[PDB]
Amino acid sequence: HMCLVCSDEASGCHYGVLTCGSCKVFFKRAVEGQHNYLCAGRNDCIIDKIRRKNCPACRYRKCLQAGMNLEARKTKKK
Amino acid sequence: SHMCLVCSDEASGCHYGVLTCGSCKVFFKRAVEGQHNYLCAGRNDCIIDKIRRKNCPACRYRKCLQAGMNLEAR
Amino acid sequence: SHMCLVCSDEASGCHYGVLTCGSCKVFFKRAVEGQHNYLCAGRNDCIIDKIRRKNCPACRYRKCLQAGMNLEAR
Amino acid sequence: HMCLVCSDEASGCHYGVLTCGSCKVFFKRAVEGQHNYLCAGRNDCIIDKIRRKNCPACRYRKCLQAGMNLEARKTKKK
DNA sequence: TAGAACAGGGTGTTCT
DNA sequence: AAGAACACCCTGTTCT
DNA sequence: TAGAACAGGGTGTTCT
DNA sequence: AAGAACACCCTGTTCT
Ligand SMILES: [Zn+2]
Ligand SMILES: [Zn+2]
Ligand SMILES: [Zn+2]
Ligand SMILES: [Zn+2]
Ligand SMILES: [Zn+2]
Ligand SMILES: [Zn+2]
Ligand SMILES: [Zn+2]
Ligand SMILES: [Zn+2]
Incomplete structure (x- = not known):
């Protein structure tokens, strides 16, 4: 099961979304x-595993x- | 002039051998x-300039x- | 009297059939x-009493x- | 490698000591x-894996x- | 789960 | 001019 | 890593 | 007297 941001291996819901670790701390x-940040394109x-550093x-x-x-932890509560 | 031919930063001089900044030189x-x-994501x-050259x-x-x-230019 | 023969709580009556509290009954x-x-850790x-009977x-x-x-006592 | 409290499988240093999960939250x-708490003995x-609930x-x-x-996290810092 | 924090990679500068 | 090398930033892991 | 929170086990009560 | 059954507490896991 996969990160919805970069399609690396998802490690759980983080900030409300199935993402991998790197995207969570990102x-x-x-x-x-x-x-x-500036996009150069x-x-x-394309944000996938090798390219996600690029932009x-x-x-x-x-x-x-x-x-x-x-606030999706204390807000997936109330 | 004094603009990098690659990123259009202020080119120090001539390197490898083109009018380039020092970043592009060593890069x-x-x-x-x-x-x-390296693989392009676009x-x-x-667009390669002083701030974006890092991106791609x-x-x-x-x-x-x-x-x-x-x-080897010498 | 009215003390549990097992833990010395206030025994309700006679159960299974000994002068026991209701906790010991159902326990x-x-x-x-x-x-x-069940295995003893000591x-x-x-010591089995109202507060410690839970422990062991x-x-x-x-x-x-x-x-x-x-x-079966009846 | 083992919990220093109950000898179940240790899951990392917690509150400054190699313990298992259950002892950490305990x-x-x-x-x-x-x-x-009252000891009945x-x-x-003996605090090991089956008996650790007992006392x-x-x-x-x-x-x-x-x-x-x-305070062994913010105190294994200063 | 959310968070700290270390080591590694890449970059751009200063200094020879 | 070209190279070394440090210090910085961003990243992605581990967290016995 | 530290922390939240759910489900499961055990217990003791009330009520038949 | 004996049994059912609820609500409580403590525990140890998972946290796609
Ligand atoms: Zn990702
Ligand atoms: Zn972009
Ligand atoms: Zn340049
Ligand atoms: Zn590109
Ligand atoms: Zn009793
Ligand atoms: Zn005992
Ligand atoms: Zn333990
Ligand atoms: Zn004890």
């Missing part, structure tokens, strides 16, 4: 910090698009 | 010397080659 | 009926048997 | 809550004796 770091870069801008976008949010 | 040596496998036409070394490397860089 | 049925394996002489069912059970409980 | 629950009960009093003691403490 999202968390982008959300807590600055995410002023057309904002549709943070598009990786973050695919994170948001897949529905990740930080 | 190029590393791309040819080691390996390394369309093999990425396949495309950076290709631009280096096409501006005629070569580890 | 005993469960110990014999199901199984379950020395097979545990091996010893509780043994005391039940030794006070002559039996699922 | 300690944590005893420390955050009330631990007014001589305060040397919280002695299990907790073996936890303290083995050196567990909550």
